[PDB]
Design a binder for this molecule. Structure first.
Ligand SMILES: [K+]
Ligand SMILES: [K+]
Ligand SMILES: [Mg+2]
Ligand SMILES: [Mg+2]
Ligand SMILES: [Mg+2]
Ligand SMILES: [Mg+2]
Ligand SMILES: [Mg+2]
Ligand SMILES: [Mg+2]
Ligand SMILES: [Mg+2]
Ligand SMILES: [Mg+2]
Ligand SMILES: [Mg+2]
Ligand SMILES: [Mg+2]
Ligand SMILES: [Mg+2]
Ligand SMILES: [Mg+2]
Ligand SMILES: [Mg+2]
Ligand SMILES: [Mg+2]
Lengths: 74, 54, 56, 150, 195, 39, 48
RNA sequence: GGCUGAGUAGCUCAAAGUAGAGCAUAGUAAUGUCUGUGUUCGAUCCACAGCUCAGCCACCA
RNA sequence: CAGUCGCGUAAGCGGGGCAUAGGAUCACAAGAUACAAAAAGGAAAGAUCUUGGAUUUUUGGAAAAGCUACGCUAGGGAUAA
RNA sequence: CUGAAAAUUUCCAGUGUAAAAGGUAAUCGAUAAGAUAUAAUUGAAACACCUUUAUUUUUCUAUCGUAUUAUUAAACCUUAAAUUAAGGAACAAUUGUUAGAAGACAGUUUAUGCGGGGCACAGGCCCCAUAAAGAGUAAAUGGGUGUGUCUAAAA
RNA sequence: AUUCUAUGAUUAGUGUGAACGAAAAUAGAGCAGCCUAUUAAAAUAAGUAAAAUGGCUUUAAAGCUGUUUGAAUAUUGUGGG
């Protein structure tokens, strides 16, 4: 324990445009690693970045981000 | 409306001023117990004394 | 009891009332001797008590 | 191989504490029909104390008798009765304040090296569950009110 | 002994506020009295379960009414309970004298006051169920319904017992396997010494 | 400031803020005149 | 290392002190000294 | 200046329900918990204070 | 001189030792004082008084090893052959 | 000692593998019997049951870390106009930070005194003589085993 | 508003030292405001302000900056000093 620690990134918020197995159902919002989204999902159009503008158009707020569901089954 | 001297504000007072009444009381308490402390020190003696500040 | 219980608060600096340290010193007794060093009992009185305790 | 100098102190952020009146409502139900003269409360107070430190061996004369009462710290806790089943919350309340104060007075009376601070206060009966105690006294439910009975 | 250990052991024992026998009695009732034997013989098992299963659920919602029990060693004693139903249209009489529980029959059923009319209910060689329904229908009282959170309490602890019993037998299979193994080791040592 | 106010808040200096004081009040914004008696 | 510098703290809680030296293999110092804050002779004891 | 780990037969090393086995000493025998102070039924053991200390940071102005 | 203590019948004596042999600022540390407080209330960092740690031993107080015959400049019969 | 479920605690005696303390005299046995416990025995300490703690051990979970394996399944890297190709691969490489480290390289110091300089030695303080009857008085002048102390006063 | 000169000022302040060294303000030279800028530019500003760390500047603030991280929405008191 300490009063200051190493600064870390928690990930990027994305809304799945498909239904990837082992992560979440379609239209699911959660924080995923930047590597997977940047190299695997975004090119294949499997998800999209949830920018502040996107939150407004979709009517949701920043308090709708969920968690990854590793147990998810198709 | 500045801090302390503003309307409805109260001066905080310097640290040595806040603990002024709590400082003279400690000194007053020690003197009242001075005769009883010297009596126990002259009876017990300098060598057998075992109470010292910390 | 009245002397040691009295508190004279004197006007000082910056409109501050406090007990002067020297007055706090004279509460136990007047200057000239160190209170506590003076023998409370008298050797003669101690001799009388010694006989009383032996008589009984 | 490893060793610690302290008693295990759990996290209380998620604990569910009860008020004195709300607690007796749960306990008085489990002791329905039990002889009140042979059923008495009890309190276990966990203390944030080090194993190396000394122990408490003082006594306390409670306002109302339950059997001078005796209490001793064995291992980071102190166990002693505080009142019979028929004790009303008003009588049982002060019967506890006298116990906590006599402790906190003995702690401050003790050395300043490791002031033993309280962590939690439990309350149970001879046949009741161990429930946590909150500093509050009145019931949270507005419908119920202080009621005394057998 | 963690905080959550003591917490789960408590919230499970807090079934007092549940569906089986809980109900909000009316203000017409004044007090209750019951008398039965210690053992379960000559028709005495019914009242016992009523005292350990459903009766505690009444004092939670009715903590103002005194419910006292008078046990005795006479196994043939009349296992009967009285209900001071009538309070004289809530006239609030001064019913100061009233006994307290005991174990040797020292607190029998006292005579009701002028503004009180008791209601006798016999129970002998009868199940708690028939005894319970006879208490509610006679003493008209509304039954409180549980909240969704209470359903989770029942559902949670129910699924917990699945994990527990699954572990009770598992850890049991490791200890007996050890006990057997340790015993086998001792037998070899004893046998070897004989040689 | 505190000092500047207290200076012109007392009648000894004939401060133009002295009228804001009561006969028993002290010019200082923190200190107060203690009470004499036994209690 | 053989002699240490000690501080005799006033027992009047006035904050005045006297500093003397004494061997390590000796008992703590205790004296009846004059306190200039209260202007009276009080008992001074070693700090530690 | 500041915390930390150690002390048991003559010498080695072991070990809260024990003081063991070697070597040394005189095939056959005997040898001891740094000290005081505590807790618990009982302490090589838990605790406290010193003694001896070693080890690690710091003053080195 | 003021303060307030010891001894002495008293006069009086006592601001270490029969005399003559070891250091400052600065920085840091522990106490007091109540001075100032960069808008204001506080505080920080400062100021005054007391005190401590120095082969600061080149001891009026630098953190510091050699070769040149490949040698250079400015001077010195103030200096050697 | 992240938390959860479950379990475990053996000197002799002791019904027997007594974890400890506190509270308690009844608890269990669907209506018929009896098992537990209290008693009594043993022991320093006596047991069910309800509580709060202590020690130890499994699985799950949290965290950290090692080793390995896979990877157009488009990280990156290599050949390749540079491709659904081939190989390597979460390494390497680069950036930032941190520690160690070559006079390889750079700046600077290495002084002064001395019957020339070099080597050597020397630097503050105290007593005596030289010192010429006040005080002062030099020399790589003569003496000294001189000095960086000791000391709270009492049993 | 910016710019130039003088005073403020061998000052505040910094630095073991040697030294380095502001601003408010004042006087003078000039004077000019605007976004429909008199040449064609905002839908009022997010990897931004800021923080840790390595440096610059510097009085510890403000300012500049590589790396790793990372806000809020107007005096109805939001944001910077
Ligand atoms: K491959
Ligand atoms: K800055
Ligand atoms: Mg990352
Ligand atoms: Mg000397
Ligand atoms: Mg200010
Ligand atoms: Mg010199
Ligand atoms: Mg000199
Ligand atoms: Mg040559
Ligand atoms: Mg070089
Ligand atoms: Mg002469
Ligand atoms: Mg002369
Ligand atoms: Mg200056
Ligand atoms: Mg803007
Ligand atoms: Mg910035
Ligand atoms: Mg700021
Ligand atoms: Mg800024």
């Amino acid at each position: 324990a300490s009063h200051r620690m190493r600064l870390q990134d928690q990930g990027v918020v994305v809304r799945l445009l498909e239904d990837i197995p082992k992560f979440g159902r379609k239209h699911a919002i959660f924080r995923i690693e930047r590597g997977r989204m940047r190299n695997e999902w975004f090119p294949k159009n499997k998800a999209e970045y949830m920018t502040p503008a996107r939150f407004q158009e979709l009517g949701l707020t920043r308090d709708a981000i969920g968690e990854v569901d590793r147990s998810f089954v198709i | 409306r500045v801090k302390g001297t503003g309307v409805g504000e109260k001066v905080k007072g310097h640290k040595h001023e806040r603990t002024l009444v709590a400082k003279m009381e400690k000194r007053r308490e020690a003197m009242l117990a001075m005769p009883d402390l010297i009596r126990e020190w002259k009876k017990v003696g300098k060598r057998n004394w075992t109470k010292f500040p910390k | 009891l009245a002397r040691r219980g009295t508190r004279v608060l004197r006007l000082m600096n910056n409109y501050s009332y406090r007990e002067t340290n020297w007055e706090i010193g004279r509460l136990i007794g007047d200057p000239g001797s160190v209170p506590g060093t003076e023998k409370v009992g008298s050797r003669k009185a101690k001799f009388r008590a010694r006989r009383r305790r032996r008589n009984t | 191989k490893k060793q610690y100098k302290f008693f295990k102190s759990w996290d209380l952020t998620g604990q569910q504490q009860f008020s004195l009146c709300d607690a007796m409502r749960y306990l008085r139900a489990v002791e329905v029909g039990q002889p009140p003269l042979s059923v008495k409360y009890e309190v276990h107070v966990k203390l944030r104390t080090k194993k190396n430190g000394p122990v408490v061996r003082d006594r306390v004369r409670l306002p109302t008798p339950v059997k001078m009462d005796e209490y001793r710290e064995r291992n980071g806790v102190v166990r002693m009765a505080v009142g019979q089943l028929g004790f009303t919350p008003k009588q049982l309340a002060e019967n506890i304040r006298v116990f906590m104060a006599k402790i906190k007075s003995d702690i401050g009376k003790l050395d300043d090296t490791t002031p033993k601070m309280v962590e939690e206060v439990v309350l149970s009966t001879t046949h009741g569950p161990g429930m946590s105690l909150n500093a509050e006294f009145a019931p949270t439910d507005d419908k119920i009110k202080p009621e005394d009975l057998e | 002994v963690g905080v959550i250990r003591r917490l789960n052991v408590v919230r499970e024992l807090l079934n007092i506020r549940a569906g089986p026998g809980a109900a909000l009695l009316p203000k017409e009732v004044t007090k209750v009295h019951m008398q039965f034997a210690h053992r379960i013989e000559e028709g005495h098992m019914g009242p016992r379960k009523f005292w350990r299963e459903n009766l505690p659920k009444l004092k939670y919602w009715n903590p103002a009414v005194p419910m006292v029990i008078n046990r005795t060693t006479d196994q043939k004693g009349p296992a009967v309970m009285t209900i001071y139903f009538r309070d004289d249209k809530d006239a609030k009489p001064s019913s100061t004298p009233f006994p307290t529980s005991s174990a040797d029959g020292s607190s029998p059923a006292p005579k009701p006051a002028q503004g009180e009319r008791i209601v006798t209910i016999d129970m002998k060689n009868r199940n708690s169920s028939v005894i319970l329904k006879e208490f509610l229908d006679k003493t008209g009282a509304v039954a409180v319904q549980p909240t969704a959170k209470d359903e989770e309490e029942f559902r949670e602890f129910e699924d917990l017992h699945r994990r527990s019993e699954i572990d009770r037998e598992r850890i049991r299979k490791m200890n007996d396997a050890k006990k057997r193994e340790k015993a086998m080791l001792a037998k070899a040592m004893s046998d070897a010494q004989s040689i | 400031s505190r000092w500047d106010i207290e200076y012109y808040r007392d009648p000894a200096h004939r401060g133009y803020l002295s009228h804001q004081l009561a006969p028993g009040e002290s010019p200082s914004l923190y200190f107060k005149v203690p009470t004499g008696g036994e209690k | 290392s053989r002699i240490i510098n000690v501080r005799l703290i006033s027992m009047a809680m006035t904050g005045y002190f006297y500093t003397f030296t004494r061997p390590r293999t000796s008992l703590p110092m205790s004296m009846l000294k004059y306190d200039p804050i209260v202007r009276r002779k009080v008992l001074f004891l070693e700090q530690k």
